[PDB]
Amino acid sequence: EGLRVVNLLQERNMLPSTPLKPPVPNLHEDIQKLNCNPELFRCTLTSIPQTQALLNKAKLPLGLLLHPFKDLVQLPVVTSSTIVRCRSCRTYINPFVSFLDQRRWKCNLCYRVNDVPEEEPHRRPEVQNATIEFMAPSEYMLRPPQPPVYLFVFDVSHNAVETGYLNSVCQSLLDNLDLLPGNTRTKIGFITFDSTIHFYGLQESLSQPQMLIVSDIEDVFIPMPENLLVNLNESKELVQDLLKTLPQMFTKTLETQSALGPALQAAFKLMSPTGGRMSVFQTQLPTLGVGALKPREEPNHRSSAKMTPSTDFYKKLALDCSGQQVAVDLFLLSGQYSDLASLGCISRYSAGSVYYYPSYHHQHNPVQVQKLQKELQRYLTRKIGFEAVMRIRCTKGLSIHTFHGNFFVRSTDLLSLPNVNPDAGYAVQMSVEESLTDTQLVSFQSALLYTSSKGERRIRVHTLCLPVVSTLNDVFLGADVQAISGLLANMAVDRSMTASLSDARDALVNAVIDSLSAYRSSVPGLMVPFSLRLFPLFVLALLKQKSFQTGTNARLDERIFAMCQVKNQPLVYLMLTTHPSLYRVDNLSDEGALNISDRTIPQPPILQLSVEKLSRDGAFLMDAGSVLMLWVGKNCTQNFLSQVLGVQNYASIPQPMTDLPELDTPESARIIAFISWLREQRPFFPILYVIADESPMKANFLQNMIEDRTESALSYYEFLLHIQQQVNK
Amino acid sequence: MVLLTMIARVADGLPLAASMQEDDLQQYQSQAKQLFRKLNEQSPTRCTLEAGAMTFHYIIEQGVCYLVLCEAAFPKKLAFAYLEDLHSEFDEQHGKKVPTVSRPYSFIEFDTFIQKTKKLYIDSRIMVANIEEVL
Amino acid sequence: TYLEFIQQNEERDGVRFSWNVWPSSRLEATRMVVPVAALFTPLKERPDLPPIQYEPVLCSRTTCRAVLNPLCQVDYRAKLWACNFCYQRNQFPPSYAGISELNQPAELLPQFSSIEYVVLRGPQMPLIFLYVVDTCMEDEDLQALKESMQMSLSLLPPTALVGLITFGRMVQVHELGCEGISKSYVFRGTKDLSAKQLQEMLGPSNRFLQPVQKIDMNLTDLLGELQRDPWPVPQGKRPLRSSGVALSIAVGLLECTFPNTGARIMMFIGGPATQGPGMVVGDELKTPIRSWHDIDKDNAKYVKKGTKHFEALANRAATTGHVIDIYACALDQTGLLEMKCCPNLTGGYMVMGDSFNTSLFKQTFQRVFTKDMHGQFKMGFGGTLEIKTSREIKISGAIGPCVSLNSKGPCVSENEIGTGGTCQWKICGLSPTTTLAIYFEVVRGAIQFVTQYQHSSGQRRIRVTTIARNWADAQTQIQNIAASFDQEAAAILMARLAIYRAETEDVLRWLDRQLIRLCQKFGEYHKDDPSSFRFSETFSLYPQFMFHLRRSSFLQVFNNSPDESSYYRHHFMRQDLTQSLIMIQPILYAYSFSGPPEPVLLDSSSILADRILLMDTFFQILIYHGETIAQWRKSGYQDMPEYENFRHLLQAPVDDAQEILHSRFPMPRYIDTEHGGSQARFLLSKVNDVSLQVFMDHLKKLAVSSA
Ligand SMILES: [Zn+2]
Ligand SMILES: [Zn+2]
């Protein structure tokens, strides 16, 4: 372990060769063993400052990062006829409560003594598991459990037809039609739109589905009281025929304008009585009707930091969908500026999520074609919850004051989540409202009330316990650098809209300065604690990420989507994208985890993101979470060209090489064994393309070398030099 | 002459199945749950309750309450005919599993039959008391 | 013979005048009780005239431009003809350079005073049929209406264009043959749409108006899968029926796609409009539809606003040149009163029944598509009627299915009647039976009727009728005029005036004053002696016609629903003389053992018990079985072989009925009742101030006293 001090100017090799593990809170052995999984619930400071003055001195943000609906390997379910909650703050009984009278327990959040109901009480599953799911009684639902409703809204303008996205989306719905979450209550519907809005009636009594057109754009309505949202079980054959027909209905269209606004109003009216998931597919700037947006000139590498929505239309509409338990997921497949800064609001405030496919085309862009294919497979098959609400409770004295993520905050900090998807991550920032002089431990509890796809009201609960410290040194010792970077990233996105991108970048740099300057005054080189040895590196990576970079050719919709990913993804994938993992893979061996029965899985050491680590004589795999990029040197060995790639020379490697061939070699075995171990750790299948070469014009591989310099950004060593000039000014 | 149908277990007011379509509901669904709580082994097995502009009709069979709400001008004759169509089907499909369940709305998927039978009555082509008294 | 003259001139020229000799002096022309007027049937069929395929020879005077006709003086030596209207001398066109005495052009023969020209110069347009179907009705009625439409669709030419609009709460414009999807454009039946708006919202043949040959199959599969309006009807409510918005969309669709061409907008409703503009009644079943009693006491808040909406649609469609038909079958009323202008201003049909699922409607509807000896529909489209007169004759106006083109000229009179202020009228739809009424004013004489229309075959045709009537010899003015009176035509022409003033509001006081004035001018009598009054054979039937007219359902609207009044008046303002007389005064026949069937008087003194009557009102064919024959029939004498003569009797009126029961366009209702039956009221109410004898006594008392 070690509470040592690091001079970053002498190390410069401080990144370990093994994956970073989240810090263990300085807790007793019996308390920590029950603590929540760090993948689900984690804090930036595992040792909570006792006072707000202490927290202000440390110059580090206090906050939580949670992934509450993540897929689990084992989930205990309590079906108790009564759910034991505190009579004052309604905190669910949890492993960190205190049984004194054995028939009375003390709440660990408000300190009130409660009566244990006639229903070894500390052996109960509610006390033995920090993560647990309850069965919500009838008082925990405002209405009968809503059925699963899936409404798909397709843009079919002339530009949308040219992309060809409709073919894969309809084909993906066909392949996954029986895998959609839900029972026999499952409902489905379809809407297409260009300059007018098109509904689709689905009745078995008819030879074919009927297309109903609403052309009154300023005054939309539902043309039929039935057969628009149909039961998938009963209309399976008709839904299939409509999916097989849609890609061919608009081949010779001439509609160039898109009435996205009115189409969403119609879709909202259709889903309003029930709620559910609304999948919008858009390919261009909306220009017709309400919600129309003006064109905007893109920036260039010469542009300074000089973000926000153009209209509040899609924000007002999302809040309408939120009140009706409707979540809007936005699929943007645009080859030109579509003002995602405004369209994205439809997903932020409805607990949806946005998906971006820049310059999608069914022939010219095979990368985005397979990317949409893989993301739709997960999107349509992953579990789902409906009409959900989440509450975050913390021990008296601590107060959540800022929320981050896709939802709507109601009164008394009630998080409205029309849908809850298992790939969403949320962030919270809190402060010490009252000095924690009384207690030495504090707890945090998130409760996720939702309706399962089977029609059962469930409550998933996580509880995290942390100790309270009273010195500056103990706050620094328990700092979670990745969690701090994740919270800072979410805070900078808000600063980007509230102020500007310039102020967001300054606040990120000043975060490292003030934090380390506070540490220096509390102890020649750049001295940092061991828990923050990677702090300037990760913050530098934020400043070179697509969200906050400056001297790049990043376009408007590009940057907005990166910020959407910061606000919506869990911590683990923010880090994988921001600071990718680099391994040399032209010489994999058997020091790995050859424990998984019949597979070796090599474990190459993690390299730092510098070209100085590369070599024109070998090949290197980069893991950026969403994609695996395999850079092969111009002077690579002949053993790697044929036994792994299947090629006889560097000059015959296919330019778009969409993946690796499973050749009959032990070379193409270890690498396919190590890749398979990486892509089995995540739900969104990361496409691997070896397209990365010395000259594919797709070697953005070098962009992820965040330690090196460029004509517009500092190098890592220069960054430390810049930091040092300030810490001891 | 619109719709609101709820099926519950009389002993504990446990919800079994329901069916609601708006496009308020919060006030009358509450009253329908106050009624499910008051019903016991002394209550009338067939009754009609007056709620101002609305009217509750229910029957009790096999310890299972079948309740409907509608505007008062809806035919009282058709309300009980509709509840009879629901009882015979629900008792035939789940009547022997009702006294064993514990989750609320353990028979949600009865939603379908309620709604396909519902449209057969809201399209033209016993005891009376004030609900405020019972509550 | 004056009777032979009147008959032969209606057969040849399709005209029937009130006076066939015209006043030559201003004193007589002003003192004319019944005006000089004409019942004119422009497209009357006749013993096979030769369709003449060349342009009409026009007078070369820019003002006149009359058509060459048998009244023009022709000099076959100088190749000149003199206009009978303006006296302009005209050189023959180059094509007529070879005409001769022993072989002269058709337009000069007196038997071709009425003649039709075919003008073939531009590409012919196909016919257009737009079905506007109501879906707020029972399944028996909807299925029966669907069956009637598929029969009409099976009779259309392959090149005819068809569109389908269905409505109820919403209005759906169907795009036919979109292949694999069957799409439609849905609109709110709650707000009106203009022709420009509808053009923008929707985007030779259109996507909505397709040839029958290329679409009939997709239509047949669509027309057979139609269903009720899916919106529920709560207890005690009428369905939300958007008839007014459905029609304005049907009108607006054709106005922006095929203007100035023949087209039928066929609208089939199963109830009144209950929503949106044009609404006739609210959706409360407890509030009954307005009655004439309600109209009089201002207890009908929708009538005025609903009428104004359909009058705007009718004038939009008449300006564009399209036809609107109403086929209204329901138990209660349907709003024909507020919608009457659409088939009245245009030449559209108005059919009314209790159910589309009747032999009455099914047969009436197929009569619409009756073909001639060449397999062509008997309909005409976009007719333009121009009338030219001698300088002494002026046109007061027209009454009938038409609309003014507001073309001024010297023939236009100041004193205007009905649709006046013009010498041109547009008739968007006409049949061989379409009859107008033109009223004239004198300020031989000749009148020329020129009717240019689109034949159902696509050919452009011009029908020219030139008639002449003698000026009254001044040494026998009122004597020659009196003998030329056509009491049948004058009665219908005066009925035309009365109905028009009543339907655009005393009218009976005007009818009575003109009858008394006619008695005092053309009757024989001593002063203050009613016993001395007699009428000539020329005028003797006119009082009996006025008696039935002032008591008829055309002027006494109470005892009828407001829709029934508009329906009766609709068919009276379009019919010829023979059928119009039957409307005013039903013709009666008798069937008894003592002799063959005979025409008897319309008096209660004909209602015998041992007799079978056959009364023909234009709208009903009734067969009354007197108390004696009704008992023999209730007994069973007919079936006995001893009484085969009692089978000739009870089926002779049923034999003569079927012949006329298949000719009349609106198939008249067939009634069979007897003494004691509840359906004999229609006979006792048409039979008999009080009675005709009492009516004549009062008339003779007023005619012989002060003027
Ligand atoms: Zn508590
Ligand atoms: Zn002339």
Numbering used by the authors:
A (entry chain B): 346 to 464, 476 to 662, 666 to 882, 888 to 1093
B (entry chain C): 1 to 23, 29 to 130, 148 to 157
C (entry chain A): 3 to 205, 225 to 464, 476 to 537, 541 to 723, 746 to 764
Authors' description from the paper:
The packaging of cargo transmembrane proteins into COPII-coated vesicles entails a direct interaction between COPII protein and cytoplasmically-oriented ER export signals. About a half dozen export signals have been identified to date, almost all comprising short peptide motifs, all of them binding to the Sec24 subunit of the COPII inner coat. The ΦC export signal was identified in studies of p24-family and ERGIC-53 proteins, and comprises a C-terminal signature of a pair of hydrophobic residues or a single terminal valine residue.
A series of ΦC-signal peptides was synthesized, based on a core sequence of yeast Emp24p, and individual peptides were soaked at high concentrations into two crystal forms of human COPII protein: one comprising Sec23a/Sec24a•Sec22b, the other Sec24c. For all ΦC sequences, we observed clear evidence for peptide binding to a site on Sec24a in the Sec23a/Sec24a•Sec22b crystals, based on the presence of residual electron density that matches the peptide sequence (this binding site is occluded in the Sec24c crystals). The finding that multiple classes of export motifs bind to a common site is surprising, but the COPII•ΦC crystal structures highlight that the common molecular feature is carboxylate-group recognition by the clustered arginine residues of the B site—the terminal carboxylate group of the ΦC motif adopts a similar position and bonding arrangement to the carboxylate of the glutamate side chains of LxxLE and DxE motifs.
